[PDB]
Symmetry: C2
Subunit: 286 residues, 2 copies
């Protein structure tokens, strides 16, 4: 028995139709955002701030390119309902839109030499290569639940973390339209992690207690590995700024969200995940 | 990073047509919800029990093909992309295939009866022709013959598919089911670009092969087209049996088989005498 025609009037899990409706309904393209209105704001940023922004965004671009190419697609083979497969094909597509959005921003605000140098930086940056390597290794592996754990960490932790910068600038009245575009990405990202995290939880109920325990420990070890590598990434990128400690706190905040999307309890105490209300205000994240 | 996957750069297009198609397909985004299907409810009851059943089975068969294209087709063409932008384009195509398929359940929900719909599904799960065409195309998508996969997908989209759109487009000319006709038009606006683009990439791949290999593929194409053609003929003679339009369809099958070959860069296989179709039908497409 091959493939059967999909019946959307035979939903097997109401969650599938809900996410499908939310994701498709929230469709958008970078051309829909008035990025050109940030050109003046861009001009008020220091040379150091401009480089920082470009490198950060190139980093996010790498992550979504992977999610578009290997991430979302590697989960489609593990879907437990035909409707899930359709939703995953929408997620994969939107990851392409997300990756494409950064080029939109580069075309509108930056100079070619400046952007090309950033792409060269991303090719050699240690922490960025390592994080891409780690996740990608799980995506090509044989263990489905580990692919989902990696995917949620990529979306609810690694990604969100890069959103601090546009959100900070926006709180200062700079790059407000780019910030709007990032909130469009977050609106998708929040649902992606939630959904994939939910499917992970269901798969867990079908396993022995010994097996759930092995995955829980795996989850925490992978998180600490990605977390500490993200701290190093952060300390090098924001070396100047004076914003390193704010970003770190943001990392812990999102790591807790990644964990709960997986069905686990928050791991970082409030004293480590205290995000400036200005960032939270201007945010609208998970 | 390193030599692994690199961040995609849309300001360094490697083939202008990748950007063109990306913009056209994303610009044409749509969902079945955007179509006032309900406005077709009245006209729907003006059809006999035979017509309704026929229609529902045609749409079920089409639903089977898109589901395949969404999960197996488009996705298998991924590994064969020759530019990063093509990969992103194929992911959009794969997504829209899910929208196409989902659209049919919308039509059933808005105009049919549960028992009546589940009837078509059981039918497709055993209809000899349908299961065979699905078996043929799907066998290629699973293999490691990149160019054959492209030939197969072009046949699945520019030939196998359009062959079912005839019916809905007739009602359009007549006056019945006008909103469903708008929907089908949206699916066609996508389908036409899909065959064109993939046929385009197929031709790029051909120039890189030896002269003997191109002839080999060129022959393989005709051998696959005919096998699906006769299997399609058997499919048409059955469903449209009653009605008395089988001839109209047999003539439509040939029309789209020539257009599918053109997407691959080949010459027409059926002379205009066999691939002729009512001007009204064509005027709706």
């Amino acid at each position: 028995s091959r493939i059967s025609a999909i019946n959307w009037n035979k939903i097997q899990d109401d969650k599938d139709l809900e996410v499908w409706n939310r994701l498709t309904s929230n469709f958008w393209l970078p051309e829909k955002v008035p990025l050109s209105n940030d050109i003046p704001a861009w001009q008020t940023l220091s040379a150091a701030e401009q480089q920082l922004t470009i490198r950060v965004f190139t980093g996010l671009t790498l992550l979504d390119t992977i999610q578009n190419i290997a991430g979302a697609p590697s989960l489609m083979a593990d879907a437990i309902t035909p409707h899930e497969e359709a939703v995953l094909s929408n997620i994969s597509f939107m990851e392409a839109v997300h990756a494409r959005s950064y080029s939109s921003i580069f075309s509108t605000l930056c100079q070619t030499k400046e952007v090309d140098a950033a792409y060269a930086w991303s090719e050699e940056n240690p922490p960025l290569q390592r994080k891409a390597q780690i996740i990608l290794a799980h995506y090509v592996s044989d263990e489905p639940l580990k692919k989902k754990i990696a995917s949620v960490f990529l979306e609810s932790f690694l990604f969100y973390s890069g959103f601090w910068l546009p959100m900070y600038f926006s709180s200062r009245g700079k790059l407000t339209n780019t910030a709007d575009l990032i909130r469009l990405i977050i609106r998708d990202e929040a649902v992606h992690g939630y959904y994939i995290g939910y499917k992970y939880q269901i798969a867990l109920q079908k396993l022995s207690a010994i097996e759930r325990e092995e995955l829980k420990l795996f989850a925490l070890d992978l998180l600490m590995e990605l977390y500490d590598n993200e701290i190093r990434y952060t300390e090098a990128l924001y070396a100047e700024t004076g914003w390193v400690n704010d970003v770190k706190a943001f990392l812990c905040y999102n790591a807790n969200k990644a964990l709960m999307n997986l069905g686990y309890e928050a791991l970082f105490p409030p004293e480590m995940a205290d995000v400036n209300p200005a960032i939270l205000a201007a945010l609208s994240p998970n």
